[PDB]
């Protein structure tokens, strides 16, 4: 489904790879990351992410959205402090920026 940086994510099977090595995604990590990458370049509020994260499983209520973002950044970013793929939009929320 989706490639960015050294990552490949399969939205249907929940398979993720870093440099082709299999890397797991908890339910809530997966829920947040899928909401982000499925809306490329649309900044998403915490409320809208929480909402989009809801599936038929323990997903949205696993951890706070900001803690999920922080964990996803530590997984995907060379520097979590200056993120490339999971960016902050001041006033607003978070955004996936492809490539």
- Count up the domains in the chain and report the number: 1
Place of tokens 């940086």: 5
Method: X-ray
> By residue range, what is the domain housing residue 82?
1-99
Query: Which residue spans within 1-99 are E strands per DSSP?
Result: 2-4, 7-10, 15-18, 21-22, 86-89, 93-96
H or E element at residue 31: helix 27-37
Resolution of the entry in angstroms: 2.0
State how far the Cα of 29 lies from the Cα of 85, in Å rounded to an integer: 15
Whether the Cβ atoms of residue 72 and residue 29 lie closer than 8 Å to each other: yes
Whether the Cβ atoms of residue 51 and residue 45 lie closer than 8 Å to each other: no
- C-alpha distances in angstroms, 14 versus 28, 61, 71, 90, 94? 12, 18, 17, 30, 21
- 3 state DSSP class of 61: coil
State how far the Cα of 45 lies from the Cα of 43, in Å rounded to an integer: 7
DSSP state of 98: -
Which CATH number does the domain housing residue 45 bear? 1.10.10.10
């Amino acid at each position: 489904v989706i490639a960015f940086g050294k990552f490949k994510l399969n939205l249907g099977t929940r398979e993720m790879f870093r440099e082709d090595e299999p890397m797991p995604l908890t339910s809530g990590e997966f829920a947040v990351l899928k909401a982000l990458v499925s809306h490329p370049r649309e900044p998403l509020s915490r409320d809208k992410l929480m909402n989009l994260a809801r599936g038929r499983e323990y997903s949205a209520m696993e951890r706070s959205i900001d803690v999920q973002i922080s964990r996803l950044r530590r997984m995907v970013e060379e520097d979590p402090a200056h993120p490339r793929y999971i960016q902050t939009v001041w006033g607003l929320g978070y955004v996936f920026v492809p490539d």
